[PDB]
Amino acid sequence: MRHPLVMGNWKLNGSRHMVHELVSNLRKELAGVAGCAVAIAPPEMYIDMAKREAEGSHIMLGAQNVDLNLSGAFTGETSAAMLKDIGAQYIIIGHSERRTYHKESDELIAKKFAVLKEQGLTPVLCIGETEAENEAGKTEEVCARQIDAVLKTQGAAAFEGAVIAYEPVWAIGTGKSATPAQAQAVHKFIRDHIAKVDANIAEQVIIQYGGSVNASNAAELFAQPDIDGALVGGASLKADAFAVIVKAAEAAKQ
Amino acid sequence: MRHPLVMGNWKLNGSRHMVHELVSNLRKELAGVAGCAVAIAPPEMYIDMAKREAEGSHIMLGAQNVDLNLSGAFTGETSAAMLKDIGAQYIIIGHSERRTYHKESDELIAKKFAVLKEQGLTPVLCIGETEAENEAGKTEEVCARQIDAVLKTQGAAAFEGAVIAYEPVWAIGTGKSATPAQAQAVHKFIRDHIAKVDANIAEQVIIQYGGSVNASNAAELFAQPDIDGALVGGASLKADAFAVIVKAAEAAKQ
After folding, report:
1. Which chain B residue has the Cα nearest residue A233?
2. Which residues bind substrate per the record (chains A, B)?
């Protein structure tokens, strides 16, 4: 029932030249793709440009973060109202890089979620456990805590039209691997957790895998019933590699 | 000897419609200005649009913040390389709103200053004391410390072509305001502080007043010898008001 979504998180990579080349190449590589939705999140200053270059394609826009205010005396902040105005749809919040580097709390990320829903934007809520948490067997505990920050304060209806990306931080560039079976176990837990509150809402949430995915990984991952796509890091900077993942998602969901 | 600079810090205010209207109005209101440089800092997502709207005018672009990395796996950050690529020149760092709301340290801001210099961008270094600091008589100690973060790590040569903006934070929302005499005493102190290290650099640094500046009070402030312009808040959102401030600077320094 769930239409897959593959989203490219460019992280801190981009330039006028790069945006033109990558978006152009993405359109070409994604020709004929109909069975998987596609979004990209360039650095904020390139969203407008990327949106322009994406005309004629099915590539949707997004962003890498948002702050809490819509307007006012908040020098250097990002407004959900302005993201909407410039045409970004899918807004990444709570990425592990921000939770760690910028000490973003569960409570803060939940507030970001609320402002996005209020504006009618799509949160891509990133959740996931550390090396120590995984080793301690606290995967489920951590994921539930990070989800509950929204679910307990905003209700199950907050997740209508929302996306969750599970990041196995313990497995990302660490020497440790996470299997499709292991990913499916977590995705299943996440959906079940929401279902305890509202089964209908749980059934429609898009749960993306945010761990390492490549051409060797994609088909086995996307065959899993509770994995609805992928939030892609480094591979999103190469049109061919990114399109391989998109096409694998399309093929797996048939 | 110093050519004034009036810069508009739009803060968290903007939309595509607003950018078009405001920049168009700015172009018209400022078309006959010769004796004052002008920069604007829209929200990050609108820099590209504003730069394109300003083409043909003397309105220079800027931004409200920058982070430390040029590229890499830093979701949601702002790159100095990208700010340059998109056409921003004048980069506000250490604004009181960011020192307070986002806990940015003196040391972090000095690091931002260094990254900007390496990219050939112009830092607009914001400094200023709080209500508690001002009441404790620590105006000079605080300004000196905030400047010293750069001065004692990068030398006076770092301030070549750079801009300082003094914000009396104690005057924000307190129902209080600095007189031109008070503002001038602080600007004179800042310049003398740099002159202790390099007198020639001190004489060429643009020191902007960053407290409340409007069409009404601009003339009296710009009559002061060590006030080289203004970092303007709310009045930067209305072209007519902003133009009065620019012209007052031109007239005062003519």
Report:
1. B73
2. 9-11, 173, 212, 233-234
Q: How close does chain B come to A16, measured CA to CA in Å?
A: 7
| A172 close contact with B: CB closer than 8 A | no
Indicate the number of domains in chain B: 1
| Angle, CA A163 vertex, CA A161 and CA A166 arms, to 5° | 160
Please count the other Cβ atoms lying within 10 Å of the Cβ belonging to residue A92.
Answer: 28
Phi then psi dihedrals of residue B230, to 5 deg:
-150, 145
Assign residue A144 the CATH number of its domain. 3.20.20.70
How was this structure determined? It was done by: X-ray
- For the range B17-21, what are the long-range contacts, defined as Cβ-Cβ under 8 Å and sequence gap of 24 or more? B19/B46, B19/B49, B19/B50, B19/B53, B20/B49, B20/B53
Residues of A forming the annotated binding site? 9-11, 173, 212, 233-234
Quoted resolution (Å): 1.9
Q: Which of A151, A78, A122, A114 is nearest to A229 (CA)?
A: A122
Backbone angles phi, psi at A106, to 5 degrees: -50, -40
Nearest to B39 by CA among B246, B253, B254: B246
| Closest C-alpha among A93, A100, A99, A98 to residue A115 | A93
The alpha carbon of residue B247 and the mean position of all alpha carbons in its chain are separated, in whole angstroms, by 18
B104 touches chain A (CB under 8 A): no
Q: Is B234 annotated as a binding residue?
A: yes
Range of B86's domain? 1-254
DSSP class of residue A229?
Answer: E
B64 touches chain A (CB under 8 A): yes
Its sign, for the CA torsion A179, A185, A9, A65, is negative
